[PDB]
Amino acid sequence: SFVKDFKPQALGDTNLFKPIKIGNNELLHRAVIPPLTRMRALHPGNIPNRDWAVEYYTQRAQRPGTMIITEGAFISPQAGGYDNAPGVWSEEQMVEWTKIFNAIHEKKSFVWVQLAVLGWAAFPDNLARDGLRYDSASDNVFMDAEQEAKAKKANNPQHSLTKDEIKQYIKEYVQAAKNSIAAGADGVEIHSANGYLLNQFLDPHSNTRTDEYGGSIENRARFTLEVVDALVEAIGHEKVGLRLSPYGVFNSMSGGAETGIVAQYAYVAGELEKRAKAGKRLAFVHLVEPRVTNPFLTEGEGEYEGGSNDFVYSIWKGPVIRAGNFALHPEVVREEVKDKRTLIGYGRFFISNPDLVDRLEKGLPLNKYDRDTFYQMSAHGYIDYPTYEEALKLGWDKK
Amino acid sequence: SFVKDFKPQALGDTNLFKPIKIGNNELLHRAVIPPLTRMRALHPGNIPNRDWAVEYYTQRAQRPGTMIITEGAFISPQAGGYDNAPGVWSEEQMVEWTKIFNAIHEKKSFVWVQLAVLGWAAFPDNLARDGLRYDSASDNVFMDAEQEAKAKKANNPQHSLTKDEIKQYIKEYVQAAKNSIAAGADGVEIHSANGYLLNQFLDPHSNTRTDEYGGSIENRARFTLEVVDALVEAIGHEKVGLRLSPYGVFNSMSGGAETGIVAQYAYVAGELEKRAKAGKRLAFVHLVEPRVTNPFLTEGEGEYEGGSNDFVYSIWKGPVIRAGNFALHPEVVREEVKDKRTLIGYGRFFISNPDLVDRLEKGLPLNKYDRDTFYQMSAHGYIDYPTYEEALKLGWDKK
């Protein structure tokens, strides 16, 4: 059914429907599909779903000129630890990814692979089964008690990366980016948000290191920036974006409670602008808003009111994608897109509305999502959400 | 005469006219007199003007419950270098300061001494005459060619402070703060803005040090924070504020051209909030706006549009005084004071309007200022600007 008490607004008269260039891609509108893990990849081998993934992305590519950022994709086995999320390191994976990218391009849309590395959010028992470490910035602070205990039970205690291991991850990011482009992707997004490994280095709660990768703002940012630089060198700045969540608390990040958190992210943004001014500007910076500090809480919950991401705009002068509880708040989007380099990522409601862009332009009701099937090995709740027309035929305008 | 094409707005219906507590002081309104050097102190000995300074401050204290921050006052001879700016280190000075503070208090207003240290903005020949160093963070970058040359001619080349010399300045800040309170001041403001010594340490252009006082955000902030902590210990956090100008370029600071500038100031703000949360919250943070990157340029000139100070509010949670081209822009003030912890500093138009607060409340014309007498050894352009009533009697409503 449609979301009951939602009062839609047509946004066609706003910059949301003005074209913009992101990297090499001429977007026809500024509604972006942010990365959304759906757990349909198949084990063994973290293979994108052979039955349904092409259709899922095809559906969500239907509005011409849409920018799609994929679900997080593991850069290597060591970077993973969820059996049903996909990777981008193997031939068997890239066969499937190639079909997905081709399908998106057939719809005249674009696709950017999010490159993911889990760190302490991984399941240590899966990693132990596969002969892999359970990795983070540090070895003396843990995501939660349960993860610490699972790690010990699996004889795979949380391990603080060595410099050589950080370098190995960087090699893997490079090769994953190369794989992504060669298979036809338009670009990649470096996931440095939501409490995964790079975020674990950025945040002083999770990073208690005393080497060059911790203990100061510049040190905590080092790994993220080394990945940025390695990928810019490998595939070009115009094919690389970066995702950050300054106020996030998901996966035990500090958020606004850490008084140094704005400075930490301001430093990253400044370093990106420095590179841009020296001739290597990233295609975009993607920010999760303080509107959603934990994306598994219902919209309106976990909102941090004590901070704004607006500071980033004083520093970074390129495109900015903002995500977090925007589908239910067209009144907020209307104001945000007055800024001419702002794009809006719509996550959960792109799960439930394959034709979300039409609905945004035209001010149509939205399909309610089913959170129970966000993660599920099923076509149901993945490829069977209807378009607006299909929903009318099902009687949802009367339900 | 009155400013010709100014369209005043009565601001009495805004928070500008709501009381607020700053430190120990119950302000009756939120129009603050920011620090304004006037160069009426007499040589030798940097003595506040024995003829006119009491009257100047009395005039500008006339609206009950006004917060006044003094002209910058040198903490020691070594901190100075302008013969006609006052100090707060000697008995002869404090005799005059005591009269000024008493007069302000008689008007039911409040007074905060700005503690000033010039660094590279000092005149090296004055310092040489008095057997003093010409000091800055570094010795290999200079304010301008003229200052570098004056220093060499005076056989007083720019000197990069040693750790012991930084410690000596800190002792002097402590004693100057003590002197200020003992003489009756309500508090002090640490000047870390406008390109003077502390700002010279904050800014990576002027600070090329490779010891613990330079070469990173935390290192560049070290001296400013050591002064904050020393004064909090000596006289209490409720008697201490800090002034910053993130986007300033006056005195050869970097401003927004430095991509790391927001992070540098975000770090300072975070460190202040950390101290506040641990029980020692400063009375206020005073920010110069990007509206005025150089206060000796006419209003509207030298405006930086590429940055906002709004980031500070995401970090520091105490009172914020904002200064810069607000007298001519009541429409901007009206929006800024909707934030309930925002005060507005009015500088140049408080020079020319002793009764500025009445004029702001009531939406009255403003006296034009005479920049030629901003710095001058004269009562003229200091204590002979009329109140609104006096101006009407002079015929200014017809002139």
Ligand SMILES: Cc1cc2nc3c(=O)[nH]c(=O)nc-3n(C[C@H](O)[C@H](O)[C@H](O)COP(=O)(O)O)c2cc1C
């Ligand atoms: C089921 C689900 C999966 C997600 N997967 C990812 C992911 O793989 N990578 C990522 O950076 N964010 C991921 N997110 C966070 C979203 O991209 C987005 O930032 C968040 O849901 C807030 O936007 P929204 O309110 O429009 O959903 C996910 C969120 C959800 C609900």
Ligand SMILES: Cc1cc2nc3c(=O)[nH]c(=O)nc-3n(C[C@H](O)[C@H](O)[C@H](O)COP(=O)(O)O)c2cc1C
């Ligand atoms: C003549 C003059 C003297 C000033 N002296 C000081 C000073 O001693 N300390 C300081 O921090 N700022 C000083 N300033 C900067 C002002 O406090 C203020 O930030 C600036 O003038 C912008 O505010 P306005 O547009 O209301 O004048 C001075 C400015 C002027 C024009």
Ligand SMILES: C=C(C)[C@@H]1CC=C(C)C(=O)C1
């Ligand atoms: C499996 C993934 C790479 C993650 C799933 C959920 C969130 C919120 C991510 O950011 C990535």
Ligand SMILES: C=C(C)[C@@H]1CC=C(C)C(=O)C1
């Ligand atoms: C003599 C002073 C301490 C300075 C004069 C002019 C400005 C803009 C200051 O900030 C202080």
Ligand SMILES: [Cl-]
């Ligand atoms: Cl799993």
Ligand SMILES: [Cl-]
């Ligand atoms: Cl002089």
Ligand SMILES: [Mg+2]
């Ligand atoms: Mg161990």
Ligand SMILES: [Mg+2]
């Ligand atoms: Mg020398």
Ligand code: NA
């Ligand atoms: Na789960």
Ligand code: NA
């Ligand atoms: Na499920």
Ligand code: NA
């Ligand atoms: Na002068």
Ligand code: NA
């Ligand atoms: Na003069």
